[PDB]
Write a protein that binds this DNA or RNA. Structure first.
Ligand SMILES: Nc1ncnc2c1ncn2[C@@H]1O[C@H](COP(=O)(O)OP(=O)(O)OP(=O)(O)O)[C@@H](O)[C@H]1O
Lengths: 109, 96, 96, 444, 80, 85, 97, 109, 96
DNA sequence: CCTGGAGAATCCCGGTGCCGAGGCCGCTCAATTGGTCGTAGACAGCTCTAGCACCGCTTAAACGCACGTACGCGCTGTCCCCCGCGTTTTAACCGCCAAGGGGATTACTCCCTAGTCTCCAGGCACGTGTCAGATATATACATCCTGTGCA
DNA sequence: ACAGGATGTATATATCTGACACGTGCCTGGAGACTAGGGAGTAATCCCCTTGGCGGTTAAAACGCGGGGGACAGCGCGTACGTGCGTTTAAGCGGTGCTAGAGCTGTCTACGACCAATTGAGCGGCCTCGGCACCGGGATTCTCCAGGG
């Protein structure tokens, strides 16, 4: 007899796949061995970052009167936050556009 | 049928419905989120690999992941990330 | 006759293009340029449409950032019109 | 094997039997080709013996070759004056000054070579090593041999690089912390004898191998004058504020990387620290004295001394509290004299000697373990107060026997204030064990 | 054939500048912009062609372009 | 009573030292307000590098910062240093 | 009457002398004290190897020299000779800080 | 018996440690298997690069009338050469100094 | 006895004797060359690792090393280094 | 030189099609459970190396101050270059079709690399001595800057 | 516009020193020989997706033109920095003393790799509908003359 299959993500109460993260860690040639808690830690971090960016994008979409998040909303959210902006400083988001700003000298006198 | 591809799309959708219950996401935005998750995974894993090599060890552990998170993420993001990971590992060991 | 002052239409265009999010260069000319450049490195080379789209996206983002830095340099020099010298100064400080 | 009286070439000579027999001993060592240590512990004198030896060398079989004497910069004028007023027939030069002055002096004196003895400091010796190496040295005199007591020190290696026909060492306490520094001194003396590092193993071996190359005698058993000093410890307790400071610092922002040092002068005085240092300089009034039990004890002792001698001379360990107490005595309602490392080198020798007065009625002089050199006896001093003790008992011995020269024909009392259950107990036990080692090695 | 850098036109360069945020443009900017675009594209296309030739293929893919851009420190999100 | 603080450590970076740095850079005339700005820039740079180095040292479970830690931190920030390990 | 050089010659002489020599220009002890003060905030009770401080000083000096090069370029762009905080800020903004 | 040992560096005509490079590739977590030709090729490339930089540095040291090579000579060689400058663009050479240059507008006239 | 430390010093010295026979090197220069060789090795090895991961292959080969050289080295250096590597592999295969 | 209208351009409200997002199904492959075993690292123990708190002496470097001169900065005139608008031409854009190349998948075989055992020489640590370089010192050259005539 | 004077610098020479190159001993990691196994090469097949073309349309580019504002050169000024000179200070080097802490050794366990069997989680394939794009019309707002303020 065997118990019902409980996922490690279920054990940690997460939404990201601990099993998939573990397989990616093992098949990526990062080290000889991978401990039991490292996939859980990494999955929690990935979930936190995803939740942050999605919350900011959802607020941006609410300000723009829509219900679907698009790359423009993602770009607005990422460039309007300083921490995420420094994290993604060297990244281009396709179909993202630019932040509206005009240098105050170009405005008519 | 064609060969299977992997992605984080279902989990991204779960987190989206968790944080904002009445919002959807387009395919291009989902592709962007998938590439973002892949890139962050790559950065953290590579930093942990470098740490393990530097300290002359052969096991990636939660301490290495925590140190890589400290190195890569700035400030309050790092504080919240460390707290979240610690809660996750604590609960996983408690309920195991 | 109604003629706007020389510079208001420029600000209207600035606002319009900073609100829009789509490509600005024409796709067929960009594709022909890409094939011309690839002709030197290898003969009879085929392409995917997604490759050309990604190349155009990256080229546009690079040029937009370049122009923003050029505007900063020109404003530093107490001008309003950007110049080849401003472009070269931006490139030199970036590290080309 | 030589004359029993002073030679007829010394001037103002009053050298006694001990000094004339030491001169005979040194001359015999020179005749048989043996160097050594003139381990004259105390007032019996070593400058007189060294100068008389060099003068005998000149005034007997002609050896006018190069000779070098090494002194601290605080004794250059003293040594030149001693040479002038004891043996004027001998010629001496001094290498002192900035770069231009030193270059001028070597150019106009050293290379012409009208000199016979050159008196230099350690620092100038290190500066002009390439200049001195160009000479065939014969006799080398190093005062305070504990300066080179260790190898792997620049001065010791440099002074070994020199070549001399003879060597000679001068010290007060050749043994300080262990037998290896003494072995370093003996290695400098005779490189080709004590090449190896190594109750029957020691004590007897040390005596039998040191008798040929050393002379040891005690002023108490030689002069029979200079009534012995009486040493008394005062076991004091630390106030409650000092106790909580000590406990908190020991169990724990202010940088704290050295537990022993940071928990040291605590028993001395808390506000010697930083962070909770006295704040706004409101005024110099009754603020510092009330905070320390040792300060209370000293403030109680001062009246009992001023109803009597009132010429104490005080000792403490930390240069800060040294200067604090120095500029405090003047304020309180007293007067002082100044001796510390800040004072420019040449001015101290005349200044302190001048301050030695028939009467001062100033009641205070302050000297630290490292604020003074070797000279200026305070025969007017009567009481020695040691606020805290150094690790090395030899430093404290030098400090407390500084006033124990001949000038002191009166018994002097030394007071050692000590606290409880603090690092000063470890300092005291280490000093006692080191002193016991020194006694068992030398006296026995 | 040839002469396709002229396909990058003055109006397009003006639109790029207006998205950047500039107001007045000198007449000699256009040739400079064409030159810098040519340099950038040459670098990226050379790297992509190296990747494709290593793969032993004859078609250049979005994966190749993305890998080249990531190598240059210009990571692109939204193509895989 | 004698107890006070002399200066702050950022003022250890001296005006003639900054002028020597500017001379090596290639500058001829220097405005008076350059010095505080340069001190601020240097403080920011050192805070970043030291944060990363202390992170590495803490992972090692040591209490002494090593040249290797400094080199690893500099390589992380993208300023590879040759000649220390 | 005493000889004086006109403003703009001793500066050039210093430029050549320092662009030729390779020594470190900041004093070692103040820099070490600054490094210790900064490291005190992140984590107390820290020791430093003597080589670590030298590496830090090397990196700091190289960074400042490159920054001053770019700042000089900005100042020359503005048709000036004197560098200013505006030039420093512009150089840092373009380089991405 | 067994044949006389020939180092693979000697086999390839190189003067760099093919064996040590093979060990480092295998222990560095870069893949699971390593071809025999890969360490040989890597050692050949390293040898060419080292020879090039050393030749330039030796020329510079001779120009300075010196028979030893110091970090100043290494920096002077790396700069003034375009390919090596691009390769070492973001690298500090300790005690190497800066290229001697003055902007032409600063020269008095 | 201190633990042994591995370095490329002897091989750098042999190459120096080959290129400039009557010349010497300094200890700091040797440390710099040591770090330079380690850096180049790490960069090329990482590029080859990423190439192999991209192509779903588990072995690093001379093809991967050549492609990494082409990607990382600028132009004429790449051409000459590729010639050197081809000659070395040819010699190692021809009679070994 | 503060107001008041034209007149373009923009935002807001409402209706229509449509196409991609989201829900739903089967299926297969990858994650889970269970058990076994070897090794990596945790833990304790000792050595000795190196770092921290501190003093004396030298002396270079920093600090402070006075004088003057380039230099940054503000203001003005000129003119020329770029912008706004209208018109004509060009080609991108879009929709659809046709064809072949080539990327992707599957099976089969075999050669290359992992792992082992042994042995031995190449590389490392340690001493040691000698020369390349830094140092100082006195010439000869180059550079700047002022001052007296007449350009 | 040069002559000359004072300043700085490049150059030749002699000494002395510490760092580098060479040798010696020794040991640990690489080379030789072998055996198994699975990853990659090779062939063959399929289908999708890239290219080539063709026509109709309309947005976009190219060209011209007038005129206003911004660039650029000039001039003046008054002030902030460079240059030189005296005085103080703190860095640099050297010793002192101490103890922590980094580094190597040995033992032992508990933790992760490996394997086998099961099954449910996720992925490709479908379909339907609501969110979005487009289109149109009215209300609103900003800009630019022109005048009377
Ligand atoms: N002319 C003299 N006649 C007799 N004794 C003298 C004479 N000069 C010096 N002394 C002795 O020297 C003592 C003090 O002299 P001084 O302090 O100069 O001694 P020192 O040679 O420096 O001794 P130390 O060995 O302690 O360094 C006197 O007490 C006395 O014993």
């Amino acid at each position: 007899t065997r118990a019902k299959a409980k996922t490690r993500s279920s054990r940690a109460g997460l939404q990201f796949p601990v099993g998939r993260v573990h397989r990616l860690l093992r098949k990526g040639n990062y080290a000889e061995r991978v401990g039991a808690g490292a996939p859980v830690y990494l999955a929690a971090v990935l979930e936190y970052l995803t939740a942050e960016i999605l919350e900011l994008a959802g607020n941006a979409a609410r300000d723009n009167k829509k219900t679907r998040i698009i790359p423009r909303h993602l770009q607005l959210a990422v460039r309007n936050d300083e921490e995420l902006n420094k994290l993604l400083g060297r990244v281009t988001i396709a179909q993202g556009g630019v932040l509206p700003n005009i240098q105050s000298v170009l405005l008519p006198k | 049928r064609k060969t299977r591809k992997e992605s984080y799309a279902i989990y991204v959708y779960k987190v989206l419905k968790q944080v904002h219950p009445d919002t959807g996401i387009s395919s291009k935005a989902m592709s962007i989120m998938n590439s973002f998750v892949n890139d962050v995974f790559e950065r953290i894993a590579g930093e942990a690999s470098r740490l393990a090599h530097y300290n002359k060890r052969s096991t990636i552990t939660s301490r290495e992941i925590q140190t890589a998170v400290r190195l890569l993420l700035p400030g309050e993001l790092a504080k919240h990330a460390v707290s979240e990971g610690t809660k996750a590992v604590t609960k996983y060991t408690s309920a195991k | 006759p109604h003629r706007y002052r020389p510079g208001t239409v420029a600000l209207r265009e600035i606002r319009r293009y900073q609100k829009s999010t789509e490509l600005l260069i024409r796709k067929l000319p960009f594709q022909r340029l890409v094939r011309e450049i690839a002709q030197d490195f290898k003969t009879d080379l085929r392409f995917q449409s997604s490759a050309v789209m990604a190349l155009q996206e990256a080229s546009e983002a690079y040029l937009v950032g370049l122009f923003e830095d050029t505007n900063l340099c020109a404003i530093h020099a107490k001008r309003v019109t950007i110049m080849p010298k401003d472009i070269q100064l931006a490139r030199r400080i970036r590290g080309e | 094997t030589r004359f029993e009286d002073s030679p007829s070439y010394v001037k103002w000579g009053k050298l006694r039997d001990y000094q004339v027999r030491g001169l005979n001993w040194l001359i015999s060592l020179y005749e048989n080709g043996i160097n050594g240590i003139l381990a004259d512990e105390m007032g019996l004198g070593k400058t007189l013996q060294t100068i008389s030896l060099l003068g005998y060398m000149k005034h007997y079989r002609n050896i006018p070759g190069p000779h070098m004497v090494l002194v601290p910069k605080s004794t250059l004028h003293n040594w030149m004056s001693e040479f002038k007023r004891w043996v004027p027939t001998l010629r001496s030069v001094c290498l002192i000054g900035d770069k231009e002055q030193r270059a001028a002096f070597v150019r106009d004196v050293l290379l012409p070579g009208e000199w016979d003895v050159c008196v230099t400091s350690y620092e100038m010796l290190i500066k002009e090593k390439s200049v001195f190496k160009k000479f065939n040295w014969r006799y080398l005199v190093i005062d305070e041999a504990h300066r080179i007591k260790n190898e792997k020190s620049k001065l010791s290696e440099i002074v070994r690089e020199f070549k001399t026909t003879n060597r000679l060492l001068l010290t007060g306490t050749p043994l300080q912390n262990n037998l290896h520094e003494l072995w370093s001194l003996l290695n400098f003396l005779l490189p080709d004898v004590f090449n190896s590092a190594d109750d029957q193993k020691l004590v007897e071996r040390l005596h039998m191998v040191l008798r040929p190359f050393l002379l040891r005698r005690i002023k108490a058993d030689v002069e029979k004058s200079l009534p012995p000093k009486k040493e008394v410890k005062i076991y004091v307790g630390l106030s409650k504020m000092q106790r909580e400071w000590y406990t908190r610092i020991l169990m724990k922002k202010m940088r704290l990387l050295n537990i022993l040092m940071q928990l040291r002068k605590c028993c001395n005085h808390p506000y010697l620290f930083d962070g909770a240092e006295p704040g706004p300089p409101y005024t110099t009034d009754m603020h510092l004295v009330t905070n320390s039990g040792k300060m209370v004890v000293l403030d109680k002792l001062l009246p009992k001394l001023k109803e009597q001698g009132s010429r104490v001379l005080i000792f403490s360990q930390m240069t800060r509290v040294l200067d604090i107490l120095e500029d405090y005595c003047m304020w309180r309602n007293y007067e002082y004299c100044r001796l510390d490392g800040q004072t420019p080198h040449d001015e101290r020798q005349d200044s302190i000697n001048a301050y030695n007065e028939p009467n001062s009625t100033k009641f205070v002089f302050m000297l630290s373990t490292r604020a003074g050199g070797l000279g200026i006896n305070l025969a007017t001093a009567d009481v020695v107060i040691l606020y805290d003790s150094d690790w090395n008992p030899q430093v404290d011995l030098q400090a407390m026997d500084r006033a124990h020269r001949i000038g002191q024909t009166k018994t002097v009392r030394v007071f050692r204030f000590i606290t409880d259950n603090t690092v000063e107990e470890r300092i005291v036990e280490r000093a006692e064990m080191k002193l016991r080692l020194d006694s068992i090695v030398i006296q026995q | 054939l040839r002469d396709n850098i002229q396909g990058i036109t003055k109006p397009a360069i003006r639109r790029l500048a207006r998205r950047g945020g500039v107001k007045r443009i000198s007449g000699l900017i256009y040739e400079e912009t064409r030159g810098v675009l040519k340099v950038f594209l040459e670098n990226v296309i050379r790297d992509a062609v190296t990747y494709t030739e290593h793969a032993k293929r004859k078609t250049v893919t979005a994966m190749d372009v993305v890998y080249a851009l990531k190598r240059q420190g210009r990571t692109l999100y939204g193509f895989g």
